[PDB]
């Protein structure tokens, strides 16, 4: 079991992008056998992102949107990354741009754009995108109020994004 | 007021809403948010929705038929009927159903080629179980020659909850 973690660090060192992102995330939270390190997380994420991995880009965007002493907070490079991610089209990126257009974070407030981004994320099962979309329907922000739309997306979010999510969690 | 929503769903299912029939069916199948475990109402909702063309309803039926109960008397041949209807429509649960069927010759002749290809189709869709089956086959060289790295890829996917982003979703379920 320890060998599997070291094997992964080995494959990541040799350019396995999947391994870089996976490990990046485990250091970001502390994991299977992995001790938590934001340093190692940011470094892995830069590796995979420079290789073009959309998930890595989005993780960076997050770390810049919510800055620590290792990654100092900056909404401008968080935007840079959410936009690279979203172009490809990663739901986390789509959500990020969504928030930016909803609240004018580094961009002019634009409710249609927000709406379309949250919808794109929401379709891909991204619970947050669904929550955001639900709020906009509930509060009639991007659109005219539809409590039932809100109900649909809130329901999806509560199921974990998809009716089958339970079963994936049932084995995790 | 959650009860009012459960009743609102009962209302929508009763008026032909396929999603609501399937959703409530699932809640009755396991026992859930405000809902009592009831295999009978589960089976009725699943039949209602399957007749309407819903792949999830079909797959659920396939499941309670491969795995018999007192309500649903076991028949892996109709379990196969439904897994095949679901799989025809891209449903990962169905695809996985055929996969098991071919892996272990349940109501069908053993065929590792088919098991492997059905598990691939389901795994592609983030379905943790299909990823596990596929991983097992590569790891123990069942359908093909042992491919430790393939095995590893799918085990990793499974361990992440089917997708690297899955943890973030499943944390809010």
Author numbering:
A (entry chain B): 353 to 524
B (entry chain A): 352 to 524
Paper text:
SEL1L, the mammalian homolog of Hrd3p, associates with HRD1, mediates HRD1 interactions with the ER luminal lectin OS9, and recognizes substrates to be degraded. Previous biochemical studies reveal that SEL1L is a type I transmembrane protein and has a large luminal domain comprising sets of repeated Sel1-like (SLR) motifs.
We found that the central domain of SEL1L, comprising SLR motifs 5 through 9 (SEL1Lcent), forms a tight dimer with two-fold symmetry due to domain swapping of the SLR motif 9. Crystals of SEL1Lcent grew in space group P21 with four copies of SEL1Lcent (a total of 82 kDa) in the asymmetric unit. The two SEL1Lcent molecules dimerize in a head-to-tail manner through a two-fold symmetry interface resulting in a cosmos-like shaped structure. Each protomer is composed of ten α-helices, which form the five SLRs, resulting in an elongated curved structure, confirming the primary structure prediction. However, the last helix, 9B, at the C-terminus adopts a different conformation, lying parallel to the long axis of helix 9A instead of forming an antiparallel SLR. Helix 9B from one protomer inserts into the empty space surrounded by the concave region in the other monomer, forming a domain-swapped conformation. For this structural geometry, two adjacent residues, Gly 512 and Gly 513, in SEL1L confer flexibility at this position by adopting main-chain dihedral angles that are disallowed for non-glycine residues. Notably, a single-residue mutation (L521A in interface 3) abolished the dimerization of SEL1Lcent.
